[PDB]
Structure 1
Amino acid sequence: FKKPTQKFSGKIGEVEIGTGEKALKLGGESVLPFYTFDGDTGNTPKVGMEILDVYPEDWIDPLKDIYKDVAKDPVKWAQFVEEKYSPDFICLRLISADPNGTDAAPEDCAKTAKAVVEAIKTPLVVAGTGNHEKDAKLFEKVAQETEGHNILLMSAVEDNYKSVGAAGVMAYNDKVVAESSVDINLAKQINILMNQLGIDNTKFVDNVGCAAGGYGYEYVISTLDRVKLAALGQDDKTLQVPIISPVSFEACKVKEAMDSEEDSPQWGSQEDRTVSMEVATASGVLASGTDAVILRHPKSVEVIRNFIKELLG
């Protein structure tokens, strides 16, 4: 029999997030994920930890027990996460800027992000809310305040891609995430718009969408497969950027993880179900072609890091 020699003409580009000795690089691979028997895998996929700019009230009880004395102050929370768990990066989610919730001015969130980014050495990812109009102004003020640290700004959708691209990559030398909703064509369109704006493939990453296991997950898997095959096999230049997936954003929000043992006695431990959901979603997206995953529970980060080390090592 002949060994399967799958030669790809394409190659994923590298994007650097952060400054100093903690800065990480994403992308650089020329084969399918964990296909060390086919060629070169550029950089190991990264695992980041999610923190909030306000106290997490909807999080499960074990998570609030882990961060009991640090979740009140985002700076203290970030320092605790960097010290005790030492992740690849920290994703600071500005929940307080949500128009649906306790809407806050962009200045307050920018100040919180500036305080956080000057206390940690690991790369920081600043994630906004689901509102495009709010996101544009928020990221303007956040990128203005957090200048000189090479942060990553999430959710630069087509509605506000110009604003986040200008306030981000162009003005204050940051990186950005071009987000598209589970479509290869939409990912191509947003990448082409970013390139025509003046931002090359070395200055942004892609978010082809994320979903928890069992909730539109096959669409995420198929989108990741199609994007990876087009970028590598077909040498499509508009898709040769690393992909980042926020897993904890949707994985921890589902009923299979949020419900406590009191609500569903047969299901069992709530923390175990949350960790299992995070691990399953992260493993699937990592196998399908993502380059960085955002997780919430520290045990999930440990399990996913061990999984990556076992597969690559």
Structure 2
Amino acid sequence: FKKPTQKFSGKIGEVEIGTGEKALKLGGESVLPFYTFDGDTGNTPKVGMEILDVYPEDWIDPLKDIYKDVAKDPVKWAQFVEEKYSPDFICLRLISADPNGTDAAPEDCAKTAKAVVEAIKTPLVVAGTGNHEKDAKLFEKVAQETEGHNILLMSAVEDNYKSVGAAGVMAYNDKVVAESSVDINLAKQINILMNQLGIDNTKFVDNVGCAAGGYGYEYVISTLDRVKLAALGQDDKTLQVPIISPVSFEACKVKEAMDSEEDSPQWGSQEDRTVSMEVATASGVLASGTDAVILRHPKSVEVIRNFIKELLG
């Protein structure tokens, strides 16, 4: 037989997040994920851990047992996570600014983000709520306060793409996440809008959507496949940015993960089901072409790191 050696004319761009020796690079691959036989994968996929500013009341009991003594303080929580598990990056989700739930002024969340970012050396990803109107002001304040650390701002959706673009990349030299929803054409549109604003492909990453396994997962898989094939096979310049997928945002809120053993006695250990859901979702999206994943349970982080190490090496 003849070895299959189809070549690609495209290459995913590289985006650097963080400062110092902990700074991580995303992108650079010229082939499909883990296709070390086809060519070179520019950077290894990065795994990050998720923390909240407020106490995680809705998380499962094992996770609240893991962070029983640090979950009150975001700074202590971030320092504990960094000292114990040493992730590639930390995602600080500002859920206290969610208008539907408890509502907070952008100044308080910006102060919390600054306190967290001035206590850790690992790259920090600041994620807002789902509200675009709140997100614009929140990210303006956060980027003003957390200046000089090259943080990543998530969910710069089209409705506020200018504001998060202006307060982020342009003003305070941060990175941004252009977010679309299970569509390759919408990802192209948001990338083109960011490029026309004056923001290069080296200044933002993409979020083509994320879902838990079993809940619209095939749409995410197909979108990842399509954007990867277009960026590499077609040399589509507007899709050549790295992709970040927040897995624990959706995979940890499903019935299979969040049902206690007393709620479903036949299913078994709640912690095992949570870790299994996280690992399955992250593994699938990593295989489909994501560059960074955000995980909640440290066991999931360890399993995914070993998975990446086994596949790449």
Q: What's the TM-score bracket when you normalise by the shorter of the two chains?
A: over 0.9
Instruction: Report the CA distance between 1:201 and its aligned residue.
Output: 0.1
Rounded to whole Å, the distance in 2 between the matches of 1:273 and 1:93 is 23
Mapping 1:1-313, distance limit 5 Å: 1-313=1-313
Rounded to whole Å, the distance in 2 between the matches of 1:18 and 1:102 is 30
Instruction: Report the CA distance between 1:117 and its aligned residue.
Output: 0.1
Rounded to whole Å, the distance in 1 between the matches of 2:6 and 2:144 is 45
Displacement over 3 Å in runs of 4+: none
Rounded to whole Å, the distance in 1 between the matches of 2:217 and 2:84 is 32
Rounded to whole Å, the distance in 1 between the matches of 2:13 and 2:278 is 27
| Number of corresponding residues | 313
Unpaired segments of 5 or more residues in structure 1?
none
Instruction: Report the CA distance between 1:6 and its aligned residue.
Output: 1.7
List per-residue Cα deviations over 1:225-282 (Å, max 9, x = no partner).
0000000000000000000000000000000000000000000000000000000000
Rounded to whole Å, the distance in 1 between the matches of 2:9 and 2:3 is 19
Rounded to whole Å, the distance in 2 between the matches of 1:146 and 1:182 is 31
Rounded to whole Å, the distance in 2 between the matches of 1:47 and 1:39 is 23
Rounded to whole Å, the distance in 1 between the matches of 2:131 and 2:221 is 25
Instruction: Report the CA distance between 1:122 and its aligned residue.
Output: 0.2
Rounded to whole Å, the distance in 1 between the matches of 2:54 and 2:7 is 48
Rounded to whole Å, the distance in 2 between the matches of 1:35 and 1:142 is 38
List per-residue Cα deviations over 1:190-220 (Å, max 9, x = no partner).
0000000000000000000000000000000
Instruction: Report the CA distance between 1:310 and its aligned residue.
Output: 0.1
Unpaired segments of 5 or more residues in structure 2?
none
Rounded to whole Å, the distance in 1 between the matches of 2:264 and 2:295 is 24
List per-residue Cα deviations over 1:83-134 (Å, max 9, x = no partner).
0000000000000000001100000000000000000000000000000000
List per-residue Cα deviations over 1:45-66 (Å, max 9, x = no partner).
0000000010000000000000
Rounded to whole Å, the distance in 2 between the matches of 1:158 and 1:222 is 22
List per-residue Cα deviations over 1:150-175 (Å, max 9, x = no partner).
00000000000000000000000000
Instruction: Report the CA distance between 1:284 and its aligned residue.
Output: 0.2
Rounded to whole Å, the distance in 1 between the matches of 2:186 and 2:258 is 31
Rounded to whole Å, the distance in 2 between the matches of 1:209 and 1:109 is 25
SS in 2 for 1:101: coil
Rounded to whole Å, the distance in 1 between the matches of 2:174 and 2:182 is 25
SS in 1 for 2:187: helix
Instruction: Report the CA distance between 1:80 and its aligned residue.
Output: 0.1
SS in 2 for 1:11: coil
SS in 1 for 2:154: strand
Rounded to whole Å, the distance in 2 between the matches of 1:163 and 1:177 is 13
Instruction: Report the CA distance between 1:14 and its aligned residue.
Output: 0.2
TM-score after normalising by structure 2: 1.00
SS in 2 for 1:48: strand
SS in 2 for 1:285: helix
Identity of aligned residues (%): 100
SS in 2 for 1:87: coil
Rounded to whole Å, the distance in 1 between the matches of 2:85 and 2:170 is 33
SS in 2 for 1:202: coil
